[PDB]
């Protein structure tokens, strides 16, 4: 509101400040000399976080150099001499804290319980010039220090962390905004030098979102990062979702969407974090199902493992096995015993016997894990887009389904189900729809094919042998199992465990596991995918080629029937051309693996009345079959496996000349040393943006600041006009007010 | 240098240094180099490939045990896949360097109860391996030179 | 080549204005802003 | 790195490169905030004494 923030502008507000900041300043150094008014020392520091909270909601719209940001600046170097103190009070107690813990202060204790027994508190101290004389009896003074050595730096150092981690916080950010606002100011600098401690502190915390403002123009926005929030942002099964991420959106997201798939990808990763926080160690009857919890993680937090487990005891089968042999007589008609060629040791077939049996365990261990692990996301994703299609473009009640697309028709079982959202967050989407299409179309049909109760039940809200054998939702489950069972990688894993237990019939069969799960590595991937790359033309010109054998087939039946013999014994006839299939199948089978075409393996025409029409007749089908259809082949699956190779590389190579939100990446921002990195990994950061709508959903409605009030407004009606566009507050303001 | 020295033992080994130093030239240094820069998809083809001939000889052993005859002086069976060594040891050995596959080397499946079997057998091998595996490691070498 | 040519021909629509030239080095400052100029302004079904 | 940790504490540490004070310089960077007495001893260098 421009008119109540001038009117504190123009008012008395810089008085009562200054002489708060003066009262705190001295009051939390009065405070912290005896350890026994420690709550009112936290209070006090609330109230300071409150205060700087308000001046920062002082400079929500302020333009660069605004008149407000030049107050506050004027404001702080009127009272120079309390925030000095401040400014210390916090850096004093960042560096003990440092300090204690370290290799030099450890070197002068000496006590068996923890004591730096005080009259050598200050030689530690001493040793490392860092504080001063009176910083240093401040210290002193500020320890308990009983029996008159009993300085327990354990909890000495972390009395003053938490409690002053907020106004440090709150007080690093206004610092920041004014510096970034109002840098032709040589009355910050020393400011902000005095707080390069506590500045430095909060460096992976702090985060810097440029948005779209509300009137006319970009604004900077400041929040907090939690430390949880980064430690599962840098999970190693984030990094690579993250890029896949990338990935199809470089190649297959095109413009005009891109935004949109980024704040689906931002909630999928937020449910994946979500998924693996419940994951971690520490996470009659009862005690089973205590104990079933338990083991159940196990495998999910240790999954991929297990895939190389398998791996290893497959490729350990497939080289017991390739010592088979077999012979028409046992060991000791048509026999044909297959046994085992025990070189020097008997223990090879119990090996083999093990070895069959732990990989099938391996395999249901492998396919329970996936279940308890990746199931579900996709259910989530299934739930989240099916709801988003029901509330916001209708396809149940205004359209429908096209008929094309068995997903939309399986969708329509989950409907009218008790409990449709079991993994998406919303569980009001049936009531936001009821109200949004219930009023044009019929309300009670919509209460009916939507399941729920009608408004005469559920108007508002005015307020395990028997449970998991009576309270399940079959149509639920079934349409669960279905969207379970089309997933690729659950039928892959389903059928590696059905040749696991098959190969207990006959051990060969462990043979096409040492094949299948090979692919699973990043370079032998894109090889399988070339052949189905191309596949709409695979097959045509494999089709051409037998059309054209085919018409070869017809020739050589009709006219150059006495040349196919194949066969010398007085038995002589052996015609391989006297039937049409027959011509055929010899063509197929081998005119095209012969080097020269069919005119190899027939005999020679020379001085037979046809010599020059079957000399034509080879030559033409060497040339149009060998060197021309083949090569056609060949370069065509070469060709599939470059260009998947090349499109891994284009989308790693394209973010390094163009920007991932506001478009112009490096001919505008690169002129400046690290001038990419800079607008990287400060005013426009991907991760930093989803950290965003993280911090905005953990947040709640009514701490709300306007800018994050304003981007969850927007949010909530899936409107993404507030991400940068072709603007990035540099070529608006930076531009000459540098 | 510990090579010339070994040459006074034997004449013969002065013929590495023929092939050692020749690559100091540029032209053939990127030669050598093209082999190494696709190092950890090389391997890794042929390891494919020799995964596929595998599945393919535990395939022959189990039925066409009876086509894999190299000899006739009555002292006939010479089985070339009588054992799993050695069927997978005919199958690395010649069955790539034949130029249609394994079928050239083994005798003709006309009229033996599983002629369209091996006839498909044949053909597979030959497309999937002669025409496909050696074609992406040519493709992979050149393209690195290139 | 054959190939390719069908490709490209595929791809310069999606940077250049089939009627006014320039297509979306100035247009796309804005979200949909190639769309816009394409649907709205020059749209050649609309010409015919 | 774990062999570049046998050159050090040695009398000529610095044979070929120009810098001979890098030692010095270190020792007067660091030797506050971390242990003089364990960078000398590290670095080999006799002490101030
Ligand atoms: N918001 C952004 N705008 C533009 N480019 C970006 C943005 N975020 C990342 N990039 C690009 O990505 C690069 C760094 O991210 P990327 O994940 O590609 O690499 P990395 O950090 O080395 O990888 P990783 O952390 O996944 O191992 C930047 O140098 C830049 O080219
Ligand atoms: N007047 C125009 N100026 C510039 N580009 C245009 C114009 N008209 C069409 N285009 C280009 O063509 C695209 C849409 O037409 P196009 O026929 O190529 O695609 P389509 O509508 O998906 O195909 P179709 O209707 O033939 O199945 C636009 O996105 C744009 O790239
Ligand atoms: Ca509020
Ligand atoms: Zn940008
Ligand atoms: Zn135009």
Redesign the interface.
């Known amino acids: 509101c421009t008119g109540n923030q001038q009117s504190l502008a123009h008012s008395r507000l810089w008085d009562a400040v200054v002489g708060f900041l003066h009262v705190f300043a001295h009051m939390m150094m009065k405070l912290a000399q005896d350890s026994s008014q420690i709550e009112l020392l936290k209070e006090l520091l609330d109230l300071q976080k409150d205060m700087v909270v308000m001046l920062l909601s002082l400079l929500e719209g302020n333009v660069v150099n605004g008149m407000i940001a030049r107050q506050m600046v004027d404001m702080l170097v009127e009272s120079s001499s309390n925030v000095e103190m401040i400014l210390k009070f916090f850096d004093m107690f960042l560096k003990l804290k440092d300090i204690v813990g370290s290799?030099?202060f450890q070197?002068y204790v000496t006590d068996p319980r923890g004591l730096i027994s005080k009259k050598d508190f200050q030689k530690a101290m001493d040793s490392?010039?860092?504080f001063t004389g009176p910083e240093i009896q401040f210290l002193l003074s500020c320890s308990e220090a009983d029996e008159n050595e009993m300085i327990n730096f354990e909890e000495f150092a972390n009395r003053f962390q938490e409690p002053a981690r907020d106004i440090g916080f709150n007080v690093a950010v206004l610092l920041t905004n004014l510096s970034e606002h109002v840098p032709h100011d040589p009355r910050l600098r020393n400011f902000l030098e005095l707080a390069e401690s506590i500045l430095e502190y909060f460096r992976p915390y702090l985060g810097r979102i440029e948005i779209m403002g509300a009137s006319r123009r970009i604004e900077r926005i400041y929040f907090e990062i939690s430390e949880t929030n980064r430690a599962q942002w840098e999970m190693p099964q984030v990094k690579e979702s993250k890029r896949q991420f990338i990935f199809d959106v470089v190649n297959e997201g095109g413009?005009?969407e891109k935004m949109e798939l980024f704040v689906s990808f931002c909630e999928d990763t937020i449910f994946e974090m979500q998924i693996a926080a419940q994951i971690s160690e520490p996470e009659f009857w009862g005690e089973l199902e205590v104990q079933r919890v338990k083991f159940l993680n196990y495998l999910s937090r240790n999954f991929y493992t297990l895939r190389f487990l398998a791996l290893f005891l497959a490729f350990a089968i497939?080289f017991i096995?390739?010592?088979?042999?077999?012979?028409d007589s046992p060991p000791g008609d048509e026999n044909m015993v297959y046994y085992f060629?025990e070189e020097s040791t008997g223990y090879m077939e119990p090996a083999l016997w093990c070895l069959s049996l732990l990989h099938t365990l391996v395999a249901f261990l492998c396919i329970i894990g996936y279940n308890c692990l990746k199931v579900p996301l996709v259910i989530f994703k299934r739930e989240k887009e099916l709801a988003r299609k029901l509330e916001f473009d209708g396809l149940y009640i205004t359209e429908q389904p096209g008929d094309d697309d068995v997903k939309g028709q399986w969708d329509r079982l989950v409907l009218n189900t008790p409990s449709f959202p079991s993994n998406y967050w919303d569980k009001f989407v049936k009531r936001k729809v009821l109200d949004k299409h219930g009023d044009i179309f019929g309300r009670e049909r919509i209460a009916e094919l939507l399941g729920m109760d009608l408004a005469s039940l559920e108007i508002t809200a005015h307020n395990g042998l028997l449970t998991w054998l009576m309270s399940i939702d079959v149509k639920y489950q079934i349409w669960k199992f279905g969207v379970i069972f089309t997933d690729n990688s659950f039928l892959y894993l389903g059928w590696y465990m059905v040749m696991s237990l098959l190969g207990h019939y006959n051990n060969?069969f462990f043979?096409?596991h040492?094949?299948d799960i090979?692919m699973g590595?990043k370079?032998?991937r894109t090889?399988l995918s070339s052949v189905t790359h191309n596949g709409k033309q695979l097959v045509m010109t494999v089709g051409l080629l037998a059309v054209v054998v085919y018409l070869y087939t017809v020739v050589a039946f009709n006219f150059f029937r006495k040349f196919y013999n194949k066969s010398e014994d007085e038995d002589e006839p052996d015609m391989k051309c006297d039937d049409m299939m027959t011509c055929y199948?010899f063509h197929?089978?081998?005119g095209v693996?012969?080097?020269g075409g069919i005119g190899d393996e027939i005999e020679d025409p020379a001085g037979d009345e046809y010599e020059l029409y079957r000399v034509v007749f080879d030559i033409t089908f060497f040339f149009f079959v060998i060197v021309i259809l083949?090569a056609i082949?060949?370069g065509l699956?070469?060709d599939a496996?470059?260009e998947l190779r090349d499109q891994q590389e284009q989308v790693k190579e394209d973010m390094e000349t163009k920007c991932f939100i506001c478009?112009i990446g490096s001919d505008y921002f690169d002129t400046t040393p690290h001038g990419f990195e800079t607008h990287t990994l400060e005013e426009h950061n991907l991760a930093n943006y989803m950290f965003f709508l993280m911090y905005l959903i953990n947040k709640d409605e009514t701490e709300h600041t306007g800018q994050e009030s304003y981007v969850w407004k927007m949010y909530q009606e899936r409107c993404?006009?507030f991400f940068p566009?072709?603007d990035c507050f540099r070529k608006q303001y930076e531009d000459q007010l540098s």
């Open positions: 290799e030099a070197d490392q010039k860092q413009e005009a497939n096995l390739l010592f088979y042999k077999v012979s060629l060969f043979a096409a040492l094949l090979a590595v370079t032998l090889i199948l197929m089978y081998v693996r012969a080097g083949l082949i060949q699956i070469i496996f470059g478009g993404w006009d566009a072709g």
